[PDB]
Amino acid sequence: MKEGEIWKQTFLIDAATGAINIGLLDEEGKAPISFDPINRVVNVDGKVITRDINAANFIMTNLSGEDNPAIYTQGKSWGDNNSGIWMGMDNTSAKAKLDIGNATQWIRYDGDVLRISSGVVIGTPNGDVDLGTGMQGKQTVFVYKLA
């Protein structure tokens, strides 16, 4: 599309290799959407919206060196009161951080101490025993009196 007096390429469909670029090229000559079928790389400078796709391997990648590579439901952050699942490595502390639950009941790991402000239940073949009650430190003590 011709702006001012210069033509800026908006897309380029290569006949020889099939490489496809979409959008206005940035200062580095890379389109916001780029296709490289020689290497088969889906590199887009944006967000992807879809529903269901299968996969095996995942890498939490820090693209710009400052973004936090983590998984979160929409509207869910680290340590917030919102209900959701948050799992990732905090770049400031270089520690994997976990946040599953809500404001009241949650399971959180900050990379150092795994604290759970939720009912932690562990099962046995004889049944289920409350972990909090199981380890309340109930000590059988004796008190003595002379009479």
Q: Which residues would be at the binding site for its own copies (CB under 8 A)?
A: 1, 10-11, 16, 18, 22-23, 32-33, 37, 39-44, 46-61, 63, 69-74, 88, 113-117, 120-126, 128-129, 131-132, 134-137, 140
Shortest spacing between CB 130 and its own copies, in angstroms? 9
Number of other CB atoms surrounding residue 34 within 10 Å: 19
Indicate the residue among 81 and 117 with the shorter CB distance to its own copies: 117
Shortest spacing between CB 54 and its own copies, in angstroms? 5
Shortest spacing between CB 58 and its own copies, in angstroms? 6
Indicate the residue among 92 and 140 with the shorter CB distance to its own copies: 140
Rounded CA-CA distance 99/114 in Å is 10
Which residues contact residue 40 at a Cβ distance below 8 angstroms, ignoring those fewer than 6 apart? Answer: none
Rounded CA-CA distance 48/112 in Å is 33
Number of other CB atoms surrounding residue 83 within 10 Å: 15
